[PDB]
């Protein structure tokens, strides 16, 4: 995984504090998805932090 | 991600959870566009990108005393092979490509230069299995012997003052060591041999290179023969020792049997060590044997321009005070040249010519560097005759007994400074081997101020041939006297209430300092000069007088001024007396070694408007020397008090677990940024494969790793701590990870409490993971 870039930075700003929902951007840095995906149809709540 | 040097030629990326990344495994030298015969030497990270210097198995370099083109590869046996340094950046996983490729070429030889060279003559390496009898050589001509002759004893008192040796009280002070026996000495065009006597004082050939081929090397190939294969090489082995097998694993390059010439060796070892500033990069040799040389390489350098290093001839270092340096210089070799052909360093007006570079490092765009002091003295070439001839001219420069107490006087004491001084003297119920008076001082009360003099007649000043010689240790003097083993065992101390130990400013000096950009630029201006010789200044730089520990020795127990009658002994007295008991993988005990100097920025907060601080650790034979500097100046750590010891230097000594370790087995020295700790990796497979009876080596497997952490009162932490009036220090301790098995690749500092270790106990990897207590290990079962 990729702790050297986004993951430098507190888990603050990684997802939104309201909906606590990880936000858009972040998703394909965790998540194996195949090729020509919607990545719409798919979201990451955090349960824990 | 972490980097790891799975062999001579690849480099695997891991992850911080000590997995590898898959499709990372690279052949950098591949990459970089260079043959089979590179291999990576240094590995450095500078930006974001990977810094690597290469040099190959099959580079040959020539000296020819003639021309202008003195020193150059030898294209005619296709050992054209240069060293390279490579730039090398990410494009994704890890994807490597070549960013800048800088070529190492051969030194500018100046005419000036070449009439030093062309005479210019050097001691074979030292060896992991080199024995204090084996540096051992044969006692010169007393001063008396040299300027006034035999049967003349009578007149010491009356003609010394037609000698210039006005009122000194040593006619029996040696004036050098015989280059007829011993260590063999070669010029830059003749090769170095695998054989090392037994007894230096009786076996050897010294200089002697055509009466070691005729008649010797015979005597030593049937005494000393290599082994073939397995077994324990049936030889007898009672007058000389094989160290093949020992040349071979510090880096000496072969043409089968027979080493290459001393150019080449020299060359191979210059291209060892690598830093990155942002205008520069710095390539200096290895702690084995001697560098005359180093690059400093402009980064904006054009791809086909030819990088030419600048040599330490005209690296005007500072010894401390002026006074340090001219002790230096003054024995390097004669003055005046009344003969024409009696060139040395001294007479051409250079400096300090060989350094034994313990480490190169950059921080905050600053070099740093360290290493010991190479012996460079002159020596008789006169073939028919004088009374010098066949003999190197050096002596001890140890202070005297009644000098003044306080660094700064004892190191400016005039003692030793332009010819010998010391010998015997008995004092009260004891001795000394260090002169008891200097100035006016006598006995009986004050005389005339006693004078010293280069030991060259001054008759026989026409018809001498004083050339320029080279050592391979931080020893001058290999004479066969007591003072020579005081001298490197630091057994020198004064009488006086308040007792400190009397430096020498000639024999195991260490030397280290700071370089700022703007030095390097000069340096580099000294390179690529073309008629004589520019000389460079390096200001921040210091020196130390740092002997082998005495307990390395049999027979010695203590350092004080009070010295037993067995002490006066001949078997604790001479270098061919001296018996070893030195656990650090070294067969001698006399001369001292220093390896991986590494900077780092300490982790603890400082005073608010202050720089953070920054210090450099080296590994010393006996101990651990931190470096201390001042951020704000980005100079040495000073003090206003003369009299304390420079405050940029502390020494820390090692125990039995420190000592323990073999030195000659150093493969990578880290720093961690978030712990402020220092990890000394030693792989033991380093270790030669026979030893000096060509016997099989059964520890040549596994690893030790060494922590040093800084200890004391460091500065800016609060208004107290502005200034400091104590040299803060480090601590070496060993970590806790170790294998006498399996053989290592790498070590991962995985994260601050945590790191990995990779090994082969087959061929088959296995990661260890490790729990770091701060600096001190334990492996965890549960961690795999």
Do not use: C
Not at chain 2, 499 to 507: A, I, K, V
Request: aromatic residues 10%; proline residues 5%; glycine residues 6%.
């Amino acid at each position: 995984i990729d702790f050297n870039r986004l993951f430098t930075l507190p888990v603050t700003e990684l997802f939104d504090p309201n909906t606590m929902f990880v936000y858009d951007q972040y998703v394909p840095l965790l998540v194996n998805l195949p090729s020509g995906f919607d990545q719409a149809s798919i979201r990451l709540k955090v349960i824990s932090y | 991600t972490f980097l790891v040097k799975e062999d001579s030629k690849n480099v695997t990326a891991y992850t911080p959870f000590a997995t590898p990344i898959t499709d990372s495994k690279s052949d950098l030298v591949s990459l970089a566009q260079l043959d089979s015969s590179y291999q990576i030497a240094d590995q450095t990270i500078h930006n974001t990108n990977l810094f690597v210097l290469f040099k190959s198995r099959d580079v040959k370099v020539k000296y020819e005393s003639s021309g202008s083109n003195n020193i150059s590869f030898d294209s005619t046996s296709q050992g054209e092979k240069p060293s390279y340094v490579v730039e090398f950046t990410n494009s994704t996983g890890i994807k490597w490509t070549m960013v800048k490729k800088y070529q190492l070429d051969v030194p500018n030889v100046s005419s000036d230069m070449n009439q030093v060279l062309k005479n210019l003559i050097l001691e074979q390496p030292l060896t992991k299995y080199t024995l204090n009898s084996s540096l051992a050589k044969e006692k010169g001509k007393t001063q008396r012997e040299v300027h006034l002759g035999s049967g003349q004893a009578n007149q010491w008192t009356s003609q010394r003052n037609q000698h210039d040796l006005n009122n000194n009280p040593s006619p029996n002070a040696s004036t050098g060591f015989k280059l007829t026996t011993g260590n063999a000495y070669r010029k830059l065009s003749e090769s170095w041999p695998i054989y090392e006597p037994i007894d230096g004082t009786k076996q050897g050939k010294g200089k002697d290179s055509s009466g070691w081929s005729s008649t010797e090397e015979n005597e030593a190939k049937n005494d000393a023969p290599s082994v073939s294969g397995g077994g324990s090489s049936s030889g007898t082995f009672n007058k000389y020792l094989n160290t093949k097998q020992a040349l071979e694993s510090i880096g000496i390059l072969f043409d089968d049997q027979t080493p290459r010439n001393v150019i080449t060796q020299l060359y191979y070892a210059s291209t060892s060590k690598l830093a990155v500033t942002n205008n520069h990069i710095v390539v200096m040799g290895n702690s084995f044997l001697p560098s005359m040389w180093y690059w400093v390489v402009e980064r904006s350098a054009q791809e086909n321009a030819s990088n030419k290093p600048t040599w330490f001839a005209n690296t005007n270092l500072d010894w401390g005070e002026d006074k340090q340096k001219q002790f230096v210089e003054n024995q390097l070799g004669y003055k005046e040249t009344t003969s024409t052909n009696s060139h040395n360093f001294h007479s051409k007006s250079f400096t300090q010519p060989a350094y034994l570079i313990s480490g190169i490092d950059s921080v905050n765009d600053q070099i740093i560097f360290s290493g010991f002091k190479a012996g460079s003295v002159g020596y008789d070439s006169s073939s028919s005759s004088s009374s010098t001839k066949d003999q190197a001219l050096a002596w001890s420069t140890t202070t005297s007994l009644d000098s003044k107490t306080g660094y700064k006087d004892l190191v400016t004491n005039d003692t030793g400074l332009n010819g010998p001084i010391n010998g015997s003297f008995s004092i009260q119920d004891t001795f000394s081997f260090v002169v008891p008076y200097s100035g006016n001082h006598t006995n009986n009360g004050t005389t005339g101020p006693i004078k010293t003099a280069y030991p060259v007649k001054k008759d026989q000043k026409s018809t001498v041939k004083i050339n320029s010689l080279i050592n391979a240790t931080p020893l001058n003097s290999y004479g066969d006297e007591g003072i020579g083993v005081f001298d490197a065992l630091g057994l020198n101390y004064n009488f006086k209430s308040n007792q400190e130990r009397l430096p020498s400013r000639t024999d195991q000096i260490f030397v280290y300092g700071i370089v700022s950009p703007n030095e390097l630029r000069s340096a580099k201006s000294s390179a690529d000069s073309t008629g004589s010789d520019t000389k460079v200044n390096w200001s921040n730089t210091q020196s130390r007088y740092l002997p082998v520990p005495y307990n390395y020795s049999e027979g010695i127990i203590d350092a004080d001024g009070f010295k037993r009658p067995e002490n006066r002994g001949a078997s604790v007295t001479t270098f061919s007396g001296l018996k070893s008991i030195a656990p650090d993988g070294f067969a001698n005990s006399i001369a001292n070694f220093s390896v991986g100097l590494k900077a780092g920025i300490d982790p603890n907060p400082v005073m608010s408007g202050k720089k953070a601080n920054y210090g450099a650790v080296v590994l010393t034979r006996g101990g651990v020397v931190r470096l201390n500097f001042n951020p704000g100046n980005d100079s040495l750590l000073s003090t206003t008090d003369n009299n304390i010891a420079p405050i940029s230097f502390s020494f820390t000594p090692f125990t039995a677990a420190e000592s323990a370790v073999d030195l000659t087995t150093f493969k990578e020295v880290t720093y961690n940024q978030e712990s402020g700790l220092w990890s000394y990796i030693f792989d033991s497979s380093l270790k030669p494969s026979h030893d000096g009876k060509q016997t099989p080596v059964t520890d040549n497997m596994g690893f030790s790793v060494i922590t040093v952490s800084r200890t004391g009162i460091e500065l800016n932490q609060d208004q107290a701590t502005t200034t400091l009036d104590v040299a803060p220090s480090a601590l070496a301790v060993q970590s806790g990870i170790q294998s006498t098995t399996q053989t290592l690749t790498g070590v991962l500092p995985l994260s601050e409490e945590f790191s990995a270790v990779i090994a082969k106990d087959s061929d088959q990897n296995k990661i260890d993971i490790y729990k770091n207590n701060n600096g001190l290990f334990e492996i965890d079962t549960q961690l795999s």
